[PDB]
Design an enzyme around this catalytic site. Structure first.
Site, PDB file in Angstrom:
ATOM      1  N   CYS A   1     -23.205 -34.061  47.658  1.00  0.00           N
ATOM      2  CA  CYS A   1     -23.873 -34.142  48.953  1.00  0.00           C
ATOM      3  C   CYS A   1     -24.416 -35.548  49.205  1.00  0.00           C
ATOM      4  CB  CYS A   1     -25.017 -33.127  49.021  1.00  0.00           C
ATOM      5  SG  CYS A   1     -24.540 -31.443  48.569  1.00  0.00           S
ATOM      6  N   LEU A   2     -23.630 -36.374  49.880  1.00  0.00           N
ATOM      7  CA  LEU A   2     -24.052 -37.735  50.197  1.00  0.00           C
ATOM      8  C   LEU A   2     -25.092 -37.735  51.317  1.00  0.00           C
ATOM      9  CD1 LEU A   2     -20.644 -39.642  50.028  1.00  0.00           C
ATOM     10  CD2 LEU A   2     -22.481 -39.599  48.329  1.00  0.00           C
TER      11      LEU A   2
END
Length: 175
Positions: A116-117
């Protein structure tokens, strides 16, 4: 404003001036050595500070990277095994790094295998394109993300690294 130290270190990771995809193998092989040097530079730079980061290697075509990165926190080391490939969109657009260690061990996951950037990374990437490289992606993406999500993994107790030695030498406790 702040975060100047981060930009200092990133500045020590030269920008790639070939910047090509896996389609043009000639320019690809050029970017490959540029990128490898950037990786070595970062690792060396880290080892000088006595804080080693990671080892990441690829296949003969460089189309798929695999390895492991370790993060020192407090007195403990957290090594994670990771893998990913290099789509034609790269390095114009960032790819998805697969971390099967964290996936499943937390509820905050994009999709099975995908990390999850941060939302801020997406415009940040687009603004700088091109002149990118894996060394940049790892440091600007994975690096800060570790300090964001890994606390969840650690505190939730899903990471099997609550100690490093346990009673033998000493507890993770420097005072």
């Amino acid at each position: 404003m702040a975060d100047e130290a981060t930009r200092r270190v990133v500045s020590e990771i030269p920008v790639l001036k070939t910047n090509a995809g896996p389609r043009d193998r000639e320019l690809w092989v050029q970017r490959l050595k540029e990128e490898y040097q950037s990786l070595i530079r970062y690792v060396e730079n880290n080892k000088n500070a006595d804080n080693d980061w990671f080892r990441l290697e690829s296949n003969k075509e460089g189309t798929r990277w695999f390895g492991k990165c370790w993060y020192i926190h407090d007195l403990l080391k957290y090594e994670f095994d990771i893998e990913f490939d290099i789509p034609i969109t790269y390095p114009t657009t960032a790819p998805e790094i697969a971390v099967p260690e964290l996936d499943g061990k937390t509820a905050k996951m994009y999709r099975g295998g995908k990390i999850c950037l941060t939302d801020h990374f997406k415009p940040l990437w687009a603004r700088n394109v091109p002149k990118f490289g894996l060394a940049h992606l790892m440091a600007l993406g994975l690096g800060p993300w570790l300090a964001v999500e890994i606390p969840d993994l650690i505190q939730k107790g899903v990471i099997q690294h609550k100690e490093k030695c346990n009673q033998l030498e000493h507890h993770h406790h420097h005072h």
